[model samples]
Target: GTISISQLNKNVWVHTELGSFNGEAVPSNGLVLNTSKGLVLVDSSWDDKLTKELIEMVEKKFQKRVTDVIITHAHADRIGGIKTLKERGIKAHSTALTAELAKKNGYEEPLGDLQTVTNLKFGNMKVETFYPGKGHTEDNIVVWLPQYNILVGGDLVKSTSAKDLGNVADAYVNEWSTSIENVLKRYRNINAVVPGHGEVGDKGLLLHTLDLLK
Candidate 1:
């Protein structure tokens, strides 16, 4: 449960060595935002233990509190630790669809995670959400870090592969292609992409992921 924090950059750190239902060994990827206003988190992660470890890692390094939680989707692996966030008094958010789906489907309650993901300014840090269409599921959405030219894509975009199709049963094979294509032009400044179940990577990663979706 004691996950290690590796600095991806001065303001970006990832919780490493976390497991996932996906095959990837180090599949739990999350982001730390040292925003102008305060520290922010992109995802709450999969378990209570790792959630604590993540907050501790941030506190120890930045000597700050995690002020926000932006859950990319409602999947258990993505929102399983809402209890941890509430205990920390962190406010959580997600796309409107994600929030509705959580309660409508008997998925994890948002507690703090139920807030709708609308555009907002946390001091200098900007938060943006885009629903690229129903690919992984109708609730899938992405978070764009405009200042850093980075996109945190949920299960909507996985690591691209030679494999013909995706593994998830909820996947919308017919709709997946166009949905990802929309992302291509939407975030041209996107220098990097953080996927839900793989290494943080370049924009081309989306291209390869679409290949797998096909």
Candidate 2:
């Protein structure tokens, strides 16, 4: 497991871990927000073993327990470490559709839906989880940090290096652009964007995703 971390700013951090999918090394990216309560984890690593290391890293670096988890989709890279999260008594969140899909695919994490709580508040930090539309998957959603102007776009947005929409077997290509367009309208001040994979970029990533979708 190759895990690397970088502090984006004073309060935001991002970690990338190497995971294999489709017989190739894919870098799974996740974000951490330091808040008064603890840390809000946007996603976890590819497996429980790596997830443990991730938490250990978090504890050593921030010295705080992960208070919340937000899964952007039901894909393995996004929700694979849910078991570890629950084992530590952390409630993972996702869209209702994502939760249903995860259950259908036999993932055992009990994911909370946005219907119950649209915006999660952690002291002065707030994260808005909403269904901007469908692109990567019907259940795909984005994590919006209004204060930081950072968007954890999950797989809904592609990295700048992405050539074509990599995986579309479960994607809504017809509605992909529209979905991302809605996201652009909602968060007008996105300064940095963390895609599900590849290098992180700015608003350019969103435009790049739209270009691929089209």
Candidate 3:
């Protein structure tokens, strides 16, 4: 499997990993934010091997180590590489609920450092971990780069190519819409939206997700 990395802005890049979902291959996108302190990864890859590849690629391209990771959910694509992070001494941040579910599902648990919405600044990059209720998974959360006006919507927001709601086995279908509303209500300025799987999009990506959820 290959990892695709593309610069979204001056300091941010979107990395996509191809992984098998059900019987088909799917893409998962995460952000690479280069800061004065160190690089911040929005999410990990599908598994440990890919996660290692991602780190190796970025540390080479960006010339900096990944100091921290923000896990969007407890699913394998997001948190399956928690052990890798721990082994490398890279901090993995997640909500307590996500940590609980990660252990429940047998993945290494990430640090429960995030609350409903906690803001942290690395160098000049300001990021917010937002809990927009439950959609893709109960522990799913989104990362907001206010500096770039980019929303790493994770699995909660779908790309334009997403024809259906993804992996609803652990989803709260009825509450998803409300969760989306919470995002739209805040963050009035959005330049790009990154989905957990598929290409990056503009604000319409979120709206498109609502349509699919409808």
Candidate 4:
């Protein structure tokens, strides 16, 4: 795994890491912030090395431990190195449905080191999750960060190369756009979005995703 960090904003950092699963390349996403209170993190990529590097990077920057972890969604690429967090005794968090899905899939404990993210709250940032009627999988949740005007979508956004409803064996294609619409309505300032599978991009990606799903 090769890890790199790019500061997206004064308070926010995007950590991108390279990973390979069965020879298939995967990108693990990371978001780091130092709000008024302490350090915060979002989504752990799918490799132990990346996860370790992320934690160390945050600790070095803030001179404090990562206080929170938010699992954007439940896919393996998002939660693969959870054990690293567990080993460190860091409290990891995710949505209720994601937790449930983790148990059902037999991780017993999903990857991404969640001690208890049963709910989302990051300083002034309030994370509200909605089940947009299942576009990728029944447990997929579109997470809205009210303060920063960003959405953390898991399998909700189509891959950059995707076209024509990419793959939905476990998805509800018809309801996906409605879910995306539901997200756009509440957070009007949505300037950027970070997807579970792609580099962060402008809001136009949402429309492109909708078209693909349609």
Candidate 5:
């Protein structure tokens, strides 16, 4: 698998990593924030090797060290690189439930510092973590980038082209429907939306997720 990065705007970037699942290639998307404080990340790529590669690419591209990461859920695709981040002394932040689920899933636990709604600031970059009920996973949370009007919607939201919900083994379908509404109500004037997998989309992604849930 190869880790790649794309500039979303002047200060926001998206990191994508390719991984093979059941003989099929899949891509996961994460976010990178270039704040004056330093570089802040939304999610880690799959596994340490790819995450290390991602870190190298980001550090070299931005010429700044990564200071922190906000993981949205407990899934491997989202949280697999927790070990790599911890080894580098980078702060890995998540909700308390997500942190517990990560440890239960055999990954290193992140700092359970977030609550239902936690607002953070890195220089002038404003980020808010919101737990909009249960959807993809019980501990899933969405990160809102107010400056860019982008939502790092882990697996709770799906890309527009997603034919169906990707994984439901640990999902709450009925609640997932309502969860999408929760997100839609909280944010308006969304410019771009990054899903847990596939390409980025706009507000339709949330509606699409609800459609898939239906």
Candidate 6:
């Protein structure tokens, strides 16, 4: 798999990697932040092989060990690499519902549940995980970096290229718009928005997703 990496800001990076679901190829995005403490990884790759590559890249490029992984949801594209993370001795975090769903689906489980609005401090940066509601999945959550004004919208917010919600097998379609709106109200100064798939954009992506939900 070819994984592309770019710095969204100072110590924050976004990775776009290739993967597949439902017998079709797809792109997946994961967030990485190098703080003074250690490395914080948001979401897993499409598979373990790519997940290993991601860890290597983080250590090589940032000279930091990935200490924790925060899965936005239980879907394969987002949490499929938990085994690799555990093998490497990294801790994984996910919502209670996500962990429950992942276990039911036979995926590696997270180390623990995020539960609610949890705050994690890595080195000099602080990461906020919020369960605003659900869109892509009942357990979907968003990561907020207040310092950089960046929001890891997860699957709750779709990329602009997305003409429609890709997979809704477990989505809360009726409450999707309300979820997106919660994100907007909570993160008022978002400078960048990273969807679970497709290119990153600004708050416009949030508005765009709300429109699609309509």
Cα lDDT tens digits, model 1, 1-214, are 4366666667766654366547644456667777666778888777766777778878778997888878777776577677788777887777666777666655555533333235756767776767777787766777777777878876777754424444567777778778788777788967678776666787877888777766
How close is every model to the real structure, measured as TM-score?
Answer: 0.85, 0.94, 0.97, 0.81, 0.97, 0.95
| Model 3 lDDT per residue over 94-164, tens place | 99999999989998878999999999899999999999999989988999998789999999999998898
Q: Give the TM-score comparing model 2 with the true structure, all chains together.
A: 0.94
Q: What is the number of residue pairs that collide in model 5?
A: 0
User: How many clashing residue pairs appear in each of the predictions shown?
Assistant: 3, 0, 0, 6, 0, 1
**lDDT of all the models against the reference?**
0.71, 0.84, 0.90, 0.65, 0.91, 0.87
Of 1 and 4, the candidate ranking higher by TM-score: 1
Ranking by TM-score: 5, 3, 6, 2, 1, 4
Query: Could you tell me how far off, in angstroms, the CA of residue 16 lies in candidate 4 after the best superposition?
Result: 1.7
User: What's the lDDT for residue 95 in model 1?
Assistant: 66
Model 4 RMSD, rounded to 1 decimal: 3.7
lDDT of 6 by residue, 1-214 (tens): 5777789987999987787558777788889998887888898787898888888888888888899899998887788889998898888988888888889878988855687798888889999999989788888999999899999988898999889897788889988899899999998878999998889999999999998999
Candidate ranking (lDDT, best to worst): 5, 3, 6, 2, 1, 4
Q: Whose lDDT is higher: candidate 5's or candidate 6's?
A: 5
Runs in model 5 lying further than 4 Å from the true structure? none
Candidate 4 residues 1-214, lDDT tens each? 4666667677677767778669877665667766665666776767567788877877887686776666656666666666776677656676566777766655436433332223356666565555555667666666666667776665677545556454567677778888777655655777567665667875766767887766
Task: Candidate 1: give its CA RMSD in angstroms.
Answer: 3.1
* Residue pair clashes in candidate 2: none
Show where candidate 4 strays beyond 4 Å: 22-24, 110-120, 124-126, 159-167
Ranking 4 against 6 by lDDT, winner: 6
Model 1 scores worst on lDDT over the 10 consecutive residues at 108-117
